[PDB]
Amino acid sequence: QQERDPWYDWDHPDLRLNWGEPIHWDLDMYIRNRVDTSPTPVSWNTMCKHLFGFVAFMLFMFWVGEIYPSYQPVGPKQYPYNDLYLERGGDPTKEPEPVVHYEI
């Protein structure tokens, strides 16, 4: 009903229907607030191909970026008290295996 004539003097201008005319079985489905079957500037198959291609390419390239990350020429950050053991998780009665940081 979106592609009906908008300039015709319909009895129900919002619905774009005339009194006494046969009503489509799926009239509720096409009520200008729902699916419309209006022709488009581009063919349906072309839009499907382009949209599908755009999404697949983006997902593939995101996977590739995950495979090949980017970073800076640095080593891991250093934290003073055994990689900050006491205040990350706690557990003070184990005396964890110590690690000391290399000054360079």
Binding site: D11, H12, P13, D14, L27, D28, N33
Partner: protein, 459 residues
């Protein structure tokens, strides 16, 4: 409890010995007074119950249902006032008599210390409702509808009676307290399986379960406004109350037997909700929404966890109030247009703004907008289902989405857009209809302040 039962009985001679022009006033006033008195039942204890006597007892599962039952009668009288104006005084008094009898039967049903008395009143509620549907119904299909609403129910409940008496022959009592205290596990056997089914399907048919719900759109569409209100608000909750009462004896068998129905509900709440998207009738849409909500309640009862039970109780109360208000709004439209078709009368917000506000609030509660008690119940049931299994959320989630859609669809098709040109008899809304909507909606937004009063005994 006789302090509530006796005045409701006295409503009958008061109605029959009233003036030809004072029956409505008298009935409304005394029904409201009875509701105020029944307000006393809400106070409950964290322990067992309020055991009044050997015959009637009250609990915090029975108390909100009793209060809603007493509160619903004045609203039914107000809405029935209009379409019965051209009726002779005897027939108006007969209508009021049917409503009073139905209230009395429901009040005695929700106390019902013993299961056979509960069954007797549970099935006694069938007669006044049938007469209301098949006598004061506008359409020709009412008769057919009545037959459905009868036989389905009886088909479900005749086995139950057998099971009930059988239980008394084995345990010796059907008193709820002894049944609770002397409960024993049910072994997995063909006999126990069938006794479980006989005990369950009677209440399953009245929720109604998906696949057994066919009687409901008929009975709701072809009944008058008072019939629709009492059917959607209270008569659907009889099955839920009965399941909460009777499942205490069906364990550990219930876990095994839960799957056939859970699926029928978990998928059902989808299908019926989808049905609401393509519906040309308001009353059928509201009926199918009721089916979806009660399917969620069925799931909650079958899961059998404290959160499940709290959510089911809250959802039952909230759904009763919301569905009654929606039916009242649809009836106010129908009394003007005489059509009962969604697409016919449109753009009613521009003509009747306050009724449009009422429509918006009713749809918002139906949509489960927080912190309304509708969403409290839905959320408790969803949390309980997630604890039961992590995949249920998908189904639940979809239902939520679908619900919103059709709710707002119902709001947009009838209230928004351009008015139908050739309809010129849309008079302004009376004080009666506005007061009816106010009295439906204010208790909901007041109950959202004190949720524990509607959350049940497991709170």
């Amino acid at each position: 409890m006789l302090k509530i039962i006796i005045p409701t009985t006295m409503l009958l001679p008061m109605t029959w010995m009233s003036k030809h022009n004072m029956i409505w006033i008298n009935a409304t006033v005394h029904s409201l007074l009875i509701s105020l008195i029944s307000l006393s039942l809400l106070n409950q204890l964290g322990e067992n119950s309020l055991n009044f006597s050997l015959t009637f007892f009250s609990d915090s599962l029975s108390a909100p249902l009793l209060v809603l039952t007493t509160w619903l009668l004045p609203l039914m009288l107000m809405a029935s006032q209009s379409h019965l104006s051209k009726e002779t005084t005897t027939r108006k008094k007969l209508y009021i008599t049917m409503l009073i009898l139905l209230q009395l039967f429901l009040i005695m049903t929700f106390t019902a210390t013993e299961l056979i008395l509960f069954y007797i009143l549970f099935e006694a509620t069938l007669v006044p409702t049938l007469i209301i549907i098949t006598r004061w119904g506008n359409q020709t299909e009412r008769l057919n509808a009545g037959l459905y609403f009868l036989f389905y129910t009886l088909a479900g409940s005749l086995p139950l009676l057998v099971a009930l008496v059988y239980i008394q022959n084995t345990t010796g009592s059907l008193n709820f307290l002894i049944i609770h205290y002397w409960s024993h596990p049910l072994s997995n056997s063909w006999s126990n399986i069938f006794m479980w089914l006989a005990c369950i399907m009677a209440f399953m048919v009245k929720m109604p379960l998906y696949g057994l719900h066919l009687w409901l759109p008929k009975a709701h569409v072809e009944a008058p406004i008072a019939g629709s209100m009492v059917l959607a608000a209270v008569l659907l909750k009889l099955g839920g109350y009965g399941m909460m009462r009777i499942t205490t004896i069906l364990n550990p068998l219930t876990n095994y037997m839960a799957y056939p129905f859970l699926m029928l509900s978990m998928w059902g709440m989808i299908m019926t909700s989808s049905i609401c998207l393509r519906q040309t009738d308001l009353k059928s849409l509201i009926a199918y929404s009721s089916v979806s909500h009660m399917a969620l309640v069925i799931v909650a009862i079958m899961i059998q966890t404290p959160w499940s039970f709290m959510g089911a109780t809250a959802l039952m109360i909230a759904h009763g109030l919301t569905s009654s208000m929606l039916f009242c709004l649809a009836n106010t439209n129908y009394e003007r247009v005489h059509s009962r078709t969604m697409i016919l009368a449109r753009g009613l917000q521009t003509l009747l703004p306050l009724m449009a506000t009422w429509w918006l609030v009713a749809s918002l509660t139906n949509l489960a907008l927080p912190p309304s008690i509708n969403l409290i119940g839905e959320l408790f049931i969803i949390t309980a289902s997630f604890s039961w299994s992590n995949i249920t959320i998908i189904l639940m989630g979809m239902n939520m989405m679908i619900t919103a859609l059709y709710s707002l669809y119902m709001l947009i098709t009838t209230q928004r857009g351009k008015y139908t040109h050739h309809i010129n008899n849309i008079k302004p809304s009376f004080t009666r209809e506005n007061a009816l909507m106010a009295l439906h909606i204010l208790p909901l937004l007041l109950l959202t302040l004190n949720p524990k009063m509607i959350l049940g005994p497991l709170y």
